[PDB]
Design a protein around this ligand. Structure first.
Ligand SMILES: [Mg+2]
Ligand SMILES: [Mg+2]
Lengths: 80, 143, 354, 95, 65, 49, 19, 74, 53
RNA sequence: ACCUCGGAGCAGAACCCAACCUCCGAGCAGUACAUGCUAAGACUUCACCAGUCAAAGCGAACCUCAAUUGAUCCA
């Protein structure tokens, strides 16, 4: 669970929450998997390293997406 | 155990346009020897007759998606000639509007050399670009 | 060996005794036009279309719907000729055309288009997107009655709704405003359905917004059987096309198989089959209006999954097949050393007994 | 080739195959394609990369090279920083 | 060397361009040979007078400078 | 394999494990004339150890 | 192909002038 | 022969499959590219009303691009 | 003795070099090329000859 | 007189096919300098050697001809 982790700060917690909505569970608990290697020790290692990278970067096709978003938001210009 | 929670492993969507919207569909690559390149998903075909001007946005299957015509009363009543640069650029603007209407954000138009050098087709392209459509098809995803 | 031709092979009609008198393809454009003529036409030999085309049945598609009104073609051409007459008689249009400085009202053009011949093109778009083959298993109709819908974003601005538009779940979270220009008196029925929203089976659809017995254009008075709930396009599932359907209820009909309680968030309740639904309830009425749009996953979809629907949210993903590789062989010849990596399972090494 | 020597009465390896090729304990052999350092100016990029890439040897000349060299060169070896530990063994081979 | 590359790259463009202008300068002179007739050996006869005239004029200008 | 050894009980963990003890338990044979400078530890078997 | 009825479908030399 | 329907062409005029599936041969019309001068001038010299044909290869895509599968029910 | 095969060099100092054909009469020439090390189009100058062709 | 390679007939229609058989040629040339790197899958001059086509990705823009040629060692 993210919000219960006291060892993380308020802004970093909310940053991770808003940035990684996809992984958060219904009950609010974050999950993350790794299955690159056969060694579960190394899997857990890269898991927690992903965690640390997320923490650091939080403490710090897309073209097409933007295109159709601009098209939609220029079309939707209408009055009641 | 909830009937709403019940979910199958595989999800079957019967929307043919889903893949081409996700950029994942397969385009009919080939025909490098023949002039019309089939590696598209939505092609624009323009017909410049000596009486009227037609435009059709269609799918690779050869079937029409949307149409614009100078023969139509709704369009020709606000005009002077059915073939001038004015008519060409107006049909271009209307077709860009109709594409934004039917959700068509991307499409393709391969002209001949003289058709490309013609000022009418150039102003049509500019009209569609300012309408909000680009005449470049995205690059397919796979690997 | 030779075999005679089955059907008339091409270029057989022309004569060869007289060749210089013949007219030629002076233009690649004319030759191309003739090429597409012969491609349009059928052929007895094997062709590209009979392999890669939808193979529509030869029978016409059944549609017992609103016929066109009896418009006097005589007076129609009369008034059109008069219109073009004063058009050509005008004075400024000459300079406008010869200087390329004219324009046209897009909104008005759209208005008279959807008034005159819009319905045919909207039917074309429907049969393209696949509404008919999935909803009615082939049968069609013509949406003679126009139809406008809007999702008011707050209250200042609004997202319009027309055939084949993107709609955000955040904007579709509420009920839309609707207009279909029918105060005649005869009743109407409206239903918002999701075609590919069902997940447990194909040939299934959900229903989000049902209204029946709508006297005139006013919509608030129209009773509701299936209350409102926005769509829930799952992340990675792709895109889901949502259809507005509108039928001309000639006389009030009851709803028992159809009567559903308070929303209760039950997909087994929201699901049904439009085919037998129309076959049962709609034998008195016919289609009058049709529209649709396209929707995708969103944070509001996640919210309604976790809170509203009272269930976990699904998470799908597109997956390509595995890359083909032929059988191995004990002694490859002239194959690079990465042939073994093409088949190795683990990227990391392993030692058998050590 | 030299099936019995005069000093020990044993088979003898030709150092040519050793300098040219490499045997993996799977039984396979590899070689550098001929002409990868000659006349590169006229050769097209695809051709020269095909020549640079390593390749295996079919079973006849594999068995030939085996008969030519001795068992000391067929034994298992555990080198350090030798990238071919992944290839000295075989994986998922049927028939 | 990288920090220096852009200047020499612009200089390379200028080299190409000046070679291109020299190409125009000589091909425009080659364009008009003679109009009186279509001879075989005369081709390289009449123009040499004007060519040597221009060369001597340039040389005299250089000496004057 | 090391777990297998210590379970079979031929090598005693009570004392310091050394290469000579491995060779006397026959955990690994060695060929010094074949210029093997020693023994490597392998990642395999990190689990259940 | 020759044996099949589609033989001679592509030929054009007799359509164009010969020289 | 000529390509078509997911079949490319190498510099040596060899045909190669771009997708995985079944092959078919058909006969269709041949509209050249304007840069092909000899083809264009042949089309011009051609008499009106007459049209040529040429063979084409077409691989029928057997399998789809992929499938949507459930990853996590959360 | 019409043409000549000549080597050109990376002026960056990387030491990356390659070869190409040149006309015997045309003078020195300096061409852009993609240095795999520097990883962008950069000018290489040709120094000497190797063999005629 | 020839000794290598390529095109055409003999070999007419998937492949291959010889003769001190019948004909024509080649032992280069021209343009770029991404004529950069990597990679699935396949062809293959009847073995091997060699010789071929190429999806995709990175990194970039926005090759033609028909043969047009040469292994290892060694320098
Ligand atoms: Mg072979
Ligand atoms: Mg590529």
């Amino acid at each position: 669970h993210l919000a219960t982790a006291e060892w993380i700060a308020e802004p970093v917690r909310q940053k991770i929450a808003i940035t990684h909505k996809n992984k958060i569970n219904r009950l609010g608990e974050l999950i993350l998997t790794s299955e690159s290697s056969r060694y579960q020790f190394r899997n857990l290692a890269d898991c927690l390293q992903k965690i640390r990278d997320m923490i650091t970067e939080a403490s710090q096709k897309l073209h097409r997406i933007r295109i159709e978003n601009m098209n939609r938001e220029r079309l939707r210009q209408k009055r009641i | 155990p909830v009937e709403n929670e019940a979910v199958a492993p595989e999800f079957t969507n019967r929307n043919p346009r889903n893949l081409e919207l996700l950029s994942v569909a397969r385009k009919e690559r080939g025909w490098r020897t023949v002039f019309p390149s089939r590696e598209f998903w939505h092609r624009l075909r323009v017909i410049r007759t000596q009486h009227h001007v037609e435009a059709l946005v269609e799918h690779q299957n050869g079937k029409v998606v949307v149409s614009a015509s100078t023969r139509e009363w709704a369009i020709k009543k606000h005009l002077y000639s059915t073939r001038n640069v004015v008519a060409c650029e107006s049909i271009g603007r209307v077709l860009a509007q109709r594409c934004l209407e039917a959700g068509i954000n991307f499409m393709v138009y391969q002209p001949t050399p003289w058709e490309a050098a013609s000022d009418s087709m150039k102003r049509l392209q500019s009209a569609m670009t300012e309408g909000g459509v680009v005449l470049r098809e995205p690059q397919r995803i796979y690997e | 060996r030779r075999t005679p031709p089955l059907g008339p092979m091409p270029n057989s009609d022309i004569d060869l005794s007289n060749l210089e008198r013949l007219e030629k393809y002076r233009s690649f454009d004319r030759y191309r036009r003739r090429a597409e003529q012969e491609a349009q036409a059928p052929h007895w030999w094997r062709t590209y279309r009979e392999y890669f085309g939808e193979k529509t049945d030869p029978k016409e598609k059944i549609d017992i719907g609103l016929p066109p009104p009896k418009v006097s073609r005589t007076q129609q051409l009369l008034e059109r000729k008069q219109a073009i007459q004063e058009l050509r008689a005008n004075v400024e249009e000459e300079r406008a055309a010869r200087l390329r400085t004219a324009s046209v009202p897009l909104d008005a053009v759209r208005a008279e288009w959807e008034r005159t011949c819009g319905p045919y093109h909207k039917q074309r778009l429907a049969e393209y997107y696949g509404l008919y083959r999935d909803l009615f298993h082939g049968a069609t109709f013509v949406p003679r009655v126009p139809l406008h819908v809007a999702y008011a974003v707050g209250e200042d601005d609004l997202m319009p709704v027309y055939c084949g538009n993107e709609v955000t779940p955040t904007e579709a979270a509420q009920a839309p405003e609707v207009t279909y220009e029918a105060e005649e008196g005869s009743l109407w029925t409206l239903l918002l359905t999701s075609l590919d929203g069902h997940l447990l089976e194909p040939d299934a659809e959900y229903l989000h917004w049902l209204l029946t017995n709508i006297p005139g254009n006013r919509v608030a008075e129209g009773q509701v059987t299936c209350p409102y709930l926005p769509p829930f396009p799952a992340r990675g599932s792709g895109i889901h096309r949502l259809a507005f359907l509108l039928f001309k209820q000639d006389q009030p009909i009851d709803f028992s198989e159809d009567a559903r309680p308070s929303p209760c968030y039950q997909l087994a309740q929201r699901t049904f089959r439009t085919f037998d639904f129309y076959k049962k309830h709609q034998e008195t009425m016919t289609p009058a209006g049709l529209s649709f749009f396209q929707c995708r996953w969103d944070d509001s979809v996640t919210y309604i999954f976790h809170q509203l629907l009272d269930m976990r949210e699904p998470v799908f993903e597109f997956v390509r097949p595995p890359p083909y590789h032929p059988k191995q062989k004990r002694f490859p010849h002239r194959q690079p050393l990465r042939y073994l990596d093409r088949y190795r399972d683990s990227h990391e090494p392993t030692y058998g007994i050590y | 080739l030299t099936y019995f020597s005069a000093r020990k009465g044993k088979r003898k390896t030709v150092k040519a195959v050793i300098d040219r090729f490499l045997r993996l304990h799977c039984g396979l052999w590899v070689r550098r394609k001929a002409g990868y350092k000659k006349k590169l100016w006229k050769k097209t990029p695809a051709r020269k990369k095909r020549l640079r890439e390593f390749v295996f040897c079919n079973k006849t000349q594999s068995k030939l090279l085996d008969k030519m060299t001795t068992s000391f060169w067929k034994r298992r070896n555990w080198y350090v920083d030798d990238p071919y530990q992944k290839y000295h063994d075989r994986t998922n081979l049927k028939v | 060397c990288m920090a220096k590359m852009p200047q020499m790259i612009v200089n390379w463009q200028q080299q190409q361009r000046e070679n291109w202008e020299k190409a125009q300068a000589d091909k425009e002179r080659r364009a008009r040979l003679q109009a009186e007739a279509q001879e075989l050996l005369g081709y390289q006869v009449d123009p040499r007078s004007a060519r040597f005239q221009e060369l001597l004029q340039d040389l005299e200008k250089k000496e004057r400078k | 394999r090391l777990q297998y050894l210590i379970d079979l009980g031929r090598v005693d963990p009570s004392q310091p494990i050394d290469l000579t003890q491995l060779v006397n338990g026959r955990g690994v044979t060695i060929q010094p004339l074949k210029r093997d400078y020693g023994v490597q530890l392998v990642e395999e078997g990190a689990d259940t150890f | 192909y020759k044996t099949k009825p589609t033989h001679g479908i592509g030929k054009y030399k007799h359509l164009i002038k010969a020289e | 022969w000529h390509p078509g329907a997911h079949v490319g062409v190498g510099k040596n005029k060899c045909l190669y499959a771009l997708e995985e599936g079944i092959v078919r041969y058909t006969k269709e019309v041949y509209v050249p590219h304007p840069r092909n001068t000899e083809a264009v001038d042949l089309i011009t010299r051609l008499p009106k009303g007459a049209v040529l044909y040429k063979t084409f290869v077409h691989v029928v895509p057997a399998k789809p691009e992929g499938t949507f599968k459930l990853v996590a029910m959360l | 003795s019409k043409n000549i095969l000549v080597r050109m060099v990376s002026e960056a100092g990387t030491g990356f070099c390659f070869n190409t054909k040149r006309n015997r009469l045309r003078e020195k020439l300096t061409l852009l090329h993609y240095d795999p090390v520097v990883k962008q189009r950069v000018l290489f100058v040709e120094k000497k000859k190797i063999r005629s062709l």
